[PDB]
A = this chain, B = another copy of it.
């Protein structure tokens, strides 16, 4: 459930357009299962600040996602993207699968600030190891992985163990690979390797 909620927020924050979400969705407000609450002057419809501190991890994830959307200029585009800037990939780079059984959508796009970002969604029930695009002289650095436990689902310089966390995945990242769970999303940034 936590994975899927993070996936929904990632998809909202990486789509072209204007993101929009109702209050209380940044920390997981529950109504008991009631989808039509137009006639309740009850605590079900009141924002809970007692339970906000219990869901600080999801709130931090949402705030970091919004900040990342602000910092990336390839997300706010006045015109529609063209094939030169946006490329589609599948399990292997440059081979998207559009069939009826497909549950894997991934793309990579260029940026003047971040250089390049890679986004992948795995809606399948089977974990997979994906092949990252081949960029001579560079490498891919993990930023977001909805499967990882907090606070490592979002990597920031505020973390004291960021470099060690990247080092413990370097053996997969050195061969342009990344292991993914089922129902999970990843975002990577391209960085020079010299």
Residues of A within 8 A of B (CB): 127-129, 147-149, 152, 161, 164-165, 167-172, 175, 177, 179, 181
Contacts and interface: CB of A to CB of B under 8 A. Distances in A.
- Ranked nearest first, the 8 interchain pairs of A and B with the lowest CB-CB distance are A179-B179, A127-B129, A147-B171, A168-B168, A148-B171, A165-B168, A149-B171, A127-B177
Query: How many copies of the shown chain assemble into the complex?
Result: 2
Given A161-B164, A164-B161, A181-B175, A149 B127 contact: no
A181 B172 contact: yes
20 contacts: A127-B129, A127-B172, A127-B177, A127-B179, A129-B129, A129-B179, A148-B168, A148-B171, A149-B170, A149-B171, A161-B164, A164-B164, A165-B168, A168-B168, A168-B169, A172-B179, A172-B181, A175-B181, A177-B181, A179-B179
